[PDB]
């Protein structure tokens, strides 16, 4: 109901400005006679009333305002001369009416314009041009004021309408931009376009290679027993915020966060040759930060980290409550290796060795060999 | 760059219409003389050129168009009489310019309007009113055409600008509405407003009572071994789509879907006295549908279902990749009872009995007693 309010506001301001223009005209007149004054009180009163009575219903009220305007100007112009400037007002109004009325009434609007034109061709001929009523000069000043008012009314009304339109656009763009930013945060951009379409299809993407890291907390049930639930949720949020910012720095992706468990995936939105190295370095950094960060109890929070690597499948499932997801054998391997991983350590398999031994340090202990860290030498 | 294109389009169409109006005027003139024709070729050519040369840079080009217009009309009007109608054009232009130029140049625009007014007060006086050039009547037809053109140009230009604005609004509203619908689908409405704010705070909500249902697949690793991954993902999506629609029918909420596991929560967005009954009935219906639905292998897909009940905590955590979540002891109970549940059966504890025995059927076998189903009698 916004197109509404644009129309109604411009009509109200237009009525106010015309009344203001007419009153100055009014006081200026001297020895002009009250045969005009009787019509003149009527015109001013009706113009002032229509904005106060613009509830009665429908589009008939704005049209009644114009009926009054046309009748008033015709009546004044007939008695006075053509040189006064009744001619210029009809021309302003012809352009103004189309702006005032909405698009579904364009045809009607066009007719109104024609009606105005029909008067003007008559106005030069039928009206006795230059019928002079009392002082002459005073009609000098009337013509000049007519020109200036005809310009100013149109300028102000047009500018006001433009202001409403631009401003509605501004609030609009902000209101949309916030939601778009949130959606962009929630999901990768490419898949968002696929979601938006009304156009239902399965999203399945096959990826030759990828790597998954799973991290979990130890003895969380303990720490829950001795702490209030509300405080515990805050602690979890703090921890995961730090982890999220580290991830965003490394450029890797996290699909989801489930309770204690934290999941990271490398290279599915885009493949890269060195995904495994990046994941290993990120895991080392995460262990450092975790051994750092502190819980309300004051005990350190150990984390078990398991890494797996292999092909994966990505895409949403369901018809409701979507999220990016991932799948593959590597996920099973990662969940396993995290589950059996010791406190404060990182566990990886025969594969993850092939790729990380050249380029990182692992040893000791399917068979699994612990990931110490990166090589000091460079 | 859309305000752009509105401005530029209206300018181009305006130039085209003025050229079209001028050419008819042109051909109509008879025995009018070529002293006018020399100016007249210049005016028409420049008007036609400016839309083709509107690249040169900046706001100087649209202003140059108006400089040419003012000079041309002043020059023609001086030689001819005032009654021709040079006066009406300046008045149309005064209103039109404000629309043509943007808001950051309003002040300049206002000055242009004043400039036009400055000419009009001069135009009546300084110009020799009614200097007649060859046939008289022909100037009849000139004045009438002047009026009609002055009306029509303004009407068409205004309507065209309004059309651009309304239409931009339409595409806009659609482009925003799709994203809003997706976001509404993803998360409950109330918490979405809390997310949207730039305004960072923890979201923790304490709920006195609630109930959780966990459902899981049996031997999914098998079925994965003998089936292609791509087909397996499609099967999962089909199953979860059916389950989602059943849930939406029952009115309950599902927080997330993780691999085989399916999670449903009752009564956290709004508490209700009979949440547990609703959850039990929903579980029975889900078992029916699951025993129905069929996998690619053709073997039935059994499901293990465990239900728990108790207080819970709800809210997002992290700083990235949010989703609604839930927490509490009931979640531990539910995960446990699902894990130990037998194939094709529903398992519930001493609590869930208190509330469901009066009103449902349970028995046999912390201690757990299997949920047969609902009482036949009514």
């Amino acid at each position: 109901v916004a197109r509404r309010q644009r129309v109604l506001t411009i009509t109200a301001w237009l009525a106010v400005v015309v009344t203001g223009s007419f009153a100055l005209m009014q006081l200026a007149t001297g020895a002009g006679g009250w045969y005009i004054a009787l019509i003149n009180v009527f015109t001013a009163v009706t113009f002032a009333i229509v904005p106060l009575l613009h509830r009665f219903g429908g589009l008939v009220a704005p049209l009644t305002f114009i009926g009054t305007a046309y009748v008033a100007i015709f009546a004044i112009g007939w008695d006075v001369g053509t040189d006064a400037g009744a001619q210029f007002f009809f021309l302003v109004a012809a352009a103004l009416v189309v702006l005032l009325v909405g698009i579904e009434h364009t045809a009607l609007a066009v007719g109104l314009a024609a009606v105005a034109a029909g008067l003007v061709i008559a106005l030069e001929f039928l009206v006795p041009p230059d019928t002079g009523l009392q002082p002459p000069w005073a009609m000098s000043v009337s013509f000049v004021l007519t020109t200036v008012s005809a310009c100013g009314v149109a300028v102000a009304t047009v500018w006001f309408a433009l202001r409403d339109t631009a401003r509605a656009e501004a609030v609009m763009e902000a209101e949309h931009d916030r939601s778009e930013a949130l959606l962009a945060n929630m999901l990768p951009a490419s898949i968002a376009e696929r979601l938006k379409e009304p156009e239902r299809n399965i999203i399945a993407d096959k990826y030759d290679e990828a790597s998954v890291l799973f991290a979990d907390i130890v003895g969380f049930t303990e720490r829950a027993s001795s702490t209030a639930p509300a405080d515990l949720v805050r602690f979890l949020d703090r921890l995961y915020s730090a982890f999220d910012e580290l991830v965003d720095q490394h450029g890797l992706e996290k699909i989801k966060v489930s309770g204690d468990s934290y999941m990271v995936v490398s290279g599915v939105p885009r493949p890269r040759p060195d995904h495994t190295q990046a994941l290993a370095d990120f895991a080392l950094d995460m262990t450092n930060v975790a051994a750092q960060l502190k819980d309300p109890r004051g005990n350190p929070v150990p984390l078990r980290v398991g890494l797996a690597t292999g092909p994966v499948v990505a895409g949403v499932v369901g018809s409701r409550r979507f999220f990016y997801d991932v799948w593959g054998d590597a996920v099973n391997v990662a969940s396993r290796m995290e589950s059996t991983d010791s406190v404060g350590q990182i566990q990886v398999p025969d594969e993850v060795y092939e790729r990380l031994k050249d380029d990182f340090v692992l040893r000791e202990r399917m068979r699994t060999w612990y990931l110490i860290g990166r090589k000091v030498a460079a | 760059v859309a305000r752009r294109q509105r401005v530029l389009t209206i300018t181009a169409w305006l130039a085209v219409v003025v050229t079209g109006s001028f050419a008819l005027m042109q051909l109509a003139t008879g025995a009018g003389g070529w002293y006018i024709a020399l100016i007249n070729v210049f005016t028409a050519v420049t008007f036609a050129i400016v839309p083709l040369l509107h690249r040169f840079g900046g706001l100087v080009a649209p202003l140059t168009f108006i400089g040419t217009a003012y000079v041309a009309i002043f020059a023609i009007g001086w030689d001819v009489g005032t009654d021709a109608g040079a006066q009406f054009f300046f008045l149309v232009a005064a209103a039109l310019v404000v629309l043509l130029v943007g808001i950051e140049h309003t002040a300049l625009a206002v000055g242009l309007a004043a400039v036009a007014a400055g000419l009009v007060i001069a135009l009546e006086f300084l110009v020799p009113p009614d200097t007649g050039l060859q046939p008289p009547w022909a100037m009849s037809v000139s004045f009438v055409l002047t009026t009609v053109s002055a009306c029509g140009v303004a009407v068409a230009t205004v309507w065209f600008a309004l059309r651009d604005t309304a239409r931009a609004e339409a595409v806009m509203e659609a482009e925003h509405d799709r994203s809003e619908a997706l976001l509404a689908n993803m998360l409950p409405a109330s918490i979405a407003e809390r997310l949207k704010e730039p305004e960072r705070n923890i979201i923790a909500d304490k709920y006195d009572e609630a109930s959780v249902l966990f459902a899981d697949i049996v031997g999914f690793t098998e079925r994965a071994s003998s089936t292609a991954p791509a087909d397996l993902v499609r099967f999962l999506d089909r199953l979860y789509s059916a389950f989602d629609e059943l849930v939406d029918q029952h009115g309950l909420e599902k927080i997330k879907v993780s691999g085989d596991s399916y999670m449903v929560v009752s009564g956290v967005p709004r508490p209700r006295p009979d949440h547990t009954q609703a959850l039990a009935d929903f579980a029975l219906d889900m078992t029916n549908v699951a025993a129905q639905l069929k996998d690619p292998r053709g073997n039935p897909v059994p499901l293990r279902v465990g239900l728990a009940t108790g207080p819970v905590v709800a809210g997002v955590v992290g700083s990235r990749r949010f989703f609604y979540d839930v927490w509490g002891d009931a979640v531990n109970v539910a995960s446990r009872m699902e894990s130990t549940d037998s194939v094709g059966q529903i398992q519930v504890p001493d609590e869930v009995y208190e509330r469901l025995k009066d009103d449902f059927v349970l028995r046999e076998r912390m201690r757990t007693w299997y949920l047969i189903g609902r009482k036949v009698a009514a």
Partner: nanobody, 116 residues
Framework: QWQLVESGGGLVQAGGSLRLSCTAS????????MGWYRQTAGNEREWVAF???????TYADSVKGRFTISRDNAKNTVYLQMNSLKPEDTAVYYC??????????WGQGTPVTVSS
């Protein structure tokens, strides 16, 4: 009835003098410009004199320095002094405003003949 009636035309030798009078009813002359027009037959009528509201006047090149346009407000009339009259000025003379001028709503004018 918005009308303009001419008078004062007639018969005269080359080099004589006339005063053509124009009286209008239905309008106010003080707020109107004004023109004296004339038809021979070889053309439509070609404007020879014009006087504006404010006192300014102008003339055709063929006639300037010979005919004078003057006014009478208390009257609501306009006059054309005419001097140095000649066979080219033998014509039929009208009087108008631009609005009536362009709308074709005119009187009969007044005849002026220059011959011996």
């Amino acid at each position: 009835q918005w009308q303009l009636v001419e008078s004062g035309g007639g018969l005269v030798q080359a080099g004589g003098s006339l005063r053509l009078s124009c009286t209008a009813s239905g309008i106010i002359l003080s707020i109107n410009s004004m023109g004296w027009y004339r038809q021979t037959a070889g053309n439509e009528r070609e404007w020879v004199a014009f006087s504006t509201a404010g006192g300014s006047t102008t003339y055709a090149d063929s006639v300037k320095g010979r005919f004078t346009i003057s006014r009478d407000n208390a009257k609501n009339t306009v006059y054309l002094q005419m001097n140095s009259l000649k066979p080219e000025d033998t014509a039929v003379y009208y009087c108008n405003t631009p609005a009536g001028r362009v709308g074709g709503t005119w009187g009969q004018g007044t005849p002026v003949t220059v011959s011996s």
